[PDB]
Structure formats: C-alpha cells, structure tokens
Design an enzyme around this catalytic site. Structure first.
Site, PDB file in Angstrom:
ATOM      1  N   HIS A  62       1.286  -0.975  -0.323  1.00 50.20           N
ATOM      2  CA  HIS A  62       0.331  -0.307   0.025  1.00 50.20           C
ATOM      3  C   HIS A  62       1.000   1.101  -0.328  1.00 50.20           C
ATOM      4  O   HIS A  62       0.318   2.257  -0.839  1.00 50.20           O
ATOM      5  CB  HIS A  62      -0.767   0.099   1.235  1.00 50.20           C
ATOM      6  N   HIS A  92       4.845   6.988   6.104  1.00 54.94           N
ATOM      7  CA  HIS A  92       4.894   7.070   5.043  1.00 54.94           C
ATOM      8  C   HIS A  92       4.791   7.590   4.698  1.00 54.94           C
ATOM      9  O   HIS A  92       4.409   8.359   4.978  1.00 54.94           O
ATOM     10  CB  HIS A  92       4.066   5.448   5.463  1.00 54.94           C
ATOM     11  N   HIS A  94       2.363   8.893   1.298  1.00 56.90           N
ATOM     12  CA  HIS A  94       1.104   8.602   0.151  1.00 56.90           C
ATOM     13  C   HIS A  94       1.435   9.961  -1.260  1.00 56.90           C
ATOM     14  O   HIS A  94       1.962  10.871  -1.075  1.00 56.90           O
ATOM     15  CB  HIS A  94      -0.297   9.792   0.710  1.00 56.90           C
ATOM     16  N   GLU A 104      -2.880  13.574   0.775  1.00 55.12           N
ATOM     17  CA  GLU A 104      -4.546  13.309   1.370  1.00 55.12           C
ATOM     18  C   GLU A 104      -5.149  14.336   1.315  1.00 55.12           C
ATOM     19  O   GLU A 104      -6.205  14.783   0.895  1.00 55.12           O
ATOM     20  CB  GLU A 104      -4.443  12.360   2.270  1.00 55.12           C
ATOM     21  N   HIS A 117       3.391  11.098   6.803  1.00 49.63           N
ATOM     22  CA  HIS A 117       3.061  10.742   7.696  1.00 49.63           C
ATOM     23  C   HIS A 117       2.956  10.322   8.710  1.00 49.63           C
ATOM     24  O   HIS A 117       3.488   9.014   8.423  1.00 49.63           O
ATOM     25  CB  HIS A 117       1.428   9.541   7.558  1.00 49.63           C
ATOM     26  N   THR A 196      -6.610   7.313   6.809  1.00 50.75           N
ATOM     27  CA  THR A 196      -6.863   6.672   6.156  1.00 50.75           C
ATOM     28  C   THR A 196      -7.070   6.314   4.299  1.00 50.75           C
ATOM     29  O   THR A 196      -6.636   6.081   3.351  1.00 50.75           O
ATOM     30  CB  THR A 196      -5.827   8.431   4.893  1.00 50.75           C
TER      31      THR A 196
HETATM   32  C1  INL Z   1       1.921  -1.129  13.788  1.00 56.38           C
HETATM   33  O1  INL Z   1       2.693  -0.332  12.778  1.00 56.38           O
HETATM   34  C2  INL Z   1       1.495  -0.427  11.325  1.00 56.38           C
HETATM   35  C3  INL Z   1       1.888  -0.777  10.405  1.00 56.38           C
HETATM   36  C4  INL Z   1       1.347  -0.184   8.670  1.00 56.38           C
HETATM   37  C5  INL Z   1       0.321   0.328   8.840  1.00 56.38           C
HETATM   38  C6  INL Z   1      -0.223   0.591  10.355  1.00 56.38           C
HETATM   39  N1  INL Z   1      -1.832   1.309  10.811  1.00 56.38           N
HETATM   40  C7  INL Z   1      -2.574   0.776   8.857  1.00 56.38           C
HETATM   41  C8  INL Z   1      -2.711  -0.683   9.433  1.00 56.38           C
HETATM   42  N2  INL Z   1      -2.834  -1.164  10.455  1.00 56.38           N
HETATM   43  C9  INL Z   1      -3.785  -2.478  10.901  1.00 56.38           C
HETATM   44  C10 INL Z   1      -3.657  -1.778  12.677  1.00 56.38           C
HETATM   45  O2  INL Z   1      -4.809  -1.670  13.659  1.00 56.38           O
HETATM   46  C11 INL Z   1      -4.706  -0.192  12.602  1.00 56.38           C
HETATM   47  C12 INL Z   1      -4.305  -0.323  11.053  1.00 56.38           C
HETATM   48  C13 INL Z   1      -3.107   2.294   8.993  1.00 56.38           C
HETATM   49  C14 INL Z   1      -2.627   3.434   8.871  1.00 56.38           C
HETATM   50  C15 INL Z   1      -3.157   4.330   8.094  1.00 56.38           C
HETATM   51  C16 INL Z   1      -2.349   6.222   8.423  1.00 56.38           C
HETATM   52  S1  INL Z   1      -2.301   7.340   7.790  1.00 56.38           S
HETATM   53  N3  INL Z   1      -2.845   6.867   6.797  1.00 56.38           N
HETATM   54  O3  INL Z   1      -4.176   7.615   8.632  1.00 56.38           O
HETATM   55  O4  INL Z   1      -1.728   8.033   8.376  1.00 56.38           O
HETATM   56  S2  INL Z   1      -1.664   5.166   9.994  1.00 56.38           S
HETATM   57  C17 INL Z   1      -2.096   3.789   9.978  1.00 56.38           C
HETATM   58  S3  INL Z   1      -1.569   2.528  10.706  1.00 56.38           S
HETATM   59  O5  INL Z   1      -2.418   2.791  11.372  1.00 56.38           O
HETATM   60  O6  INL Z   1      -0.308   3.118  11.408  1.00 56.38           O
HETATM   61  C18 INL Z   1       0.911   0.273  11.285  1.00 56.38           C
HETATM   62 ZN    ZN Z   2      -0.784   7.733   5.409  1.00 58.47          ZN
END
Ligand code: INL
Ligand code: ZN
Ligand code: HG
Length: 258
Positions: A62, A92, A94, A104, A117, A196
C-alpha cells in the site's frame, strides 16, 4: 479481493468492507484556510526526535513504511492540541503518479505531490493496538511534499527503495533521523479524524503542518518505481496511493497561527 487503490478495490469500494468509511470523522479532509479557526489556546508542537531509533523499511503493498522502535519514549510528539505523549511508530508517504497530486489532505483544494505521515500513538494506552481503539489514540503529523529542491534528509529513504520494490520486501533501515524531514516552521492545522486507509479507524488527531518540505522530482520519481504487487506477480506501479478528501461534517479545523 482485498483493498487497494485500483478501479475495483479503491477508496470508493472501501465502505463495503469497512462501513466506517462513511463515518463522521473521516480523513483526509480539505483544509479551507479561511474557515479554519485560529485558536490562540493551541500550544506549540513539541517534536522530540533526537533519540529516534529507526528499525526497517517495508513495502506493505500500500506504501512503504519506515518503522521505529516505539518500546520507549525515544521519539515523541507532545504539545499542540495533544494531551499526553505520543510515540512515533512509523512514517510512510502517499504520493501520486503526477506531481500535481498525491497528498491526501489538500489546502484550499490544492493537492501536493505527496504527504508524509508520521504516525504516533498515545502512550497512555500502553501499546499501539489499544490506541487504535480510542478516539484520541493516534496523532498523525502530516507534512506536504512539494516538488522543488532535494531534501537531503529524504535521500537515505530514496536510496533504499530499490531493495523493497515489491510487496512484502523489507530492508534494515537503522539510524535514520526523521528530524531531517521536518519543515522549518511547526505552524499547523489540527482536526479530529481517522486513518486514511482501511480499517479507517477514527482514532486520529491530525496535525497537518502549514509549511511543506521540498523534494526533487528525482526523489519523488523513485517512490513511483515501487510496486503494489509481490514478486512474481504482474507489475503494478505503486502510485496514487491516496484517499480523496472526505466531508468535514461536524468538525472545525483549528490553526495554530493567524
Ligand atoms: C503497528 O504498525 C503499523 C504498520 C503499517 C500500518 C499501520 N496502521 C494501518 C494498518 N493498521 C493495522 C493494525 O490496526 C491499525 C491500522 C493503517 C494506517 C493508515 C495511517 S494514515 N494514513 O492515516 O496515516 S496510519 C496507519 S497505521 O495505523 O499505522 C500500523
Ligand atoms: Zn498515511
Ligand atoms: Hg478509534
């Protein structure tokens, strides 16, 4: 199959598996600078990334994430609209397939080339997993990337991208200093929102920096050479991994400056 940014599994389809996609505090949103309210009670942001311990970089299909050791208060975010200390767990980006899109959040409908982010979780919740179950569990520091001059601090990330081209690949990525990605000013906008990307949890206090950082076209171009697909699968360029702006609904964007 699972979610992505394609025509068939993109943002518009997310609601089917994650109904929260149509929730009340979804992100990103458009920051209308004229409707944003200057809130003089907002404290300055306190970003302490001097003890930051980066661990590795990974292509998760992603985006690519640079993960940090969040077992202690090594790199934290405090102040601003935040209560408590938030630990940096990962950052990360986008980005778009073109320089005029990728961010975003947009400012007065203006889209930037990418958006960084820096994900932090509220330490009062003990671990990241519990934080994503709380309304103020996460604080994401968003920084817009504008295409212009190179950002020296981003070069280390750009160089390692070749080793994590496909989904599932990861590479050791220690001693990276995230302070090198910060703009000069810490003025920001803040509003309550969500992740997001699925699961789209509404646990985020967004802190979007007013000032973008500059990256060269060559630097952004290397983001675009990544693949959504895993090795051995047909090549799909990882581009446009951004979610369109969501309705602000019953929320006010506050600015730390006037
Ligand atoms: C604990 O490490 C990670 C690694 C990659 C993504 C994520 N998280 C996931 C996938 N995640 C699975 C477990 O429950 C929460 C959401 C998506 C996601 C999207 C984020 S964002 N674009 O809003 O900043 S931040 C973030 S995240 O929270 O860091 C967490
Ligand atoms: Zn993000
Ligand atoms: Hg939540």
């Amino acid at each position: 199959h699972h979610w992505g940014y394609g025509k068939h599994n993109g943002p518009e389809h997310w609601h089917k598996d994650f109904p929260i996609a149509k929730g009340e505090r979804q992100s990103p949103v458009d920051i209308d600078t004229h409707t944003a309210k200057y809130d003089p009670s907002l404290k300055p942001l306190s970003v302490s990334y001097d003890q930051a311990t980066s661990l590795r970089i990974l292509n998760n299909g992603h985006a690519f994430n640079v993960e940090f050791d969040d077992s202690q208060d090594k790199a934290v975010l405090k102040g601003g609209p935040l209560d408590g200390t938030y630990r940096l767990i990962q950052f990360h980006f986008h980005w778009g397939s073109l320089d005029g899109q990728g961010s975003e959040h947009t400012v007065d409908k203006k889209k930037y080339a990418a958006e960084l982010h820096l994900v932090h979780w509220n330490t009062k919740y003990g671990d990241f997993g519990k934080a994503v179950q709380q309304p103020d569990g996460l604080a994401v520091l968003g920084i817009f990337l504008k295409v212009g001059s190179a950002k020296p601090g981003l070069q280390k990330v750009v160089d390692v991208l070749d080793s994590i081209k496909t989904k599932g690949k990861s590479a050791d990525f220690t001693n990276f200093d995230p302070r090198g990605l910060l703009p000069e000013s810490l003025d920001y906008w803040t509003y309550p929102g969500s992740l997001t990307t699925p699961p789209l949890l509404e646990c985020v206090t967004w802190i979007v920096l007013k000032e973008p950082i500059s990256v060269s076209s060559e630097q952004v171009l290397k983001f675009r050479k990544l693949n959504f697909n895993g090795e051995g699968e047909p090549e799909e360029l990882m581009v446009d991994n951004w979610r369109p702006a969501q309705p602000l609904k019953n929320r006010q964007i506050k600015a730390s400056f006037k």
